[PDB]
A = this chain, B = another copy of it.
Amino acid sequence: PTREDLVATAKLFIAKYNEFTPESIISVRTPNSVSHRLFPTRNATRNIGESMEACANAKEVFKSLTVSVIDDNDTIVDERTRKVVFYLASRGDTIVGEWKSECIFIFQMSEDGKLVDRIWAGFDTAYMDEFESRLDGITF
Contact = CB atoms under 8 A, between A and B. Distances in A.
Interface in A85-133: 85, 87, 100-104, 106, 120, 122-130
B87 A38 contact: yes
Contacts of A124: 39-42, 125
Kindly state the interface size class of chain A when it binds its partner: 20 to 34
Q: How many copies does the complex hold?
A: 2
B122 A125 contact: no
Given A76-B85, A78-B77, A102 B3 contact: no
12 contacts: A39-B101, A41-B127, A41-B130, A76-B85, A76-B106, A77-B78, A77-B80, A85-B106, A104-B104, A104-B122, A124-B125, A129-B129
Contacts of A42: 124, 126
Contact of A126 (B80, B83, B126): B126
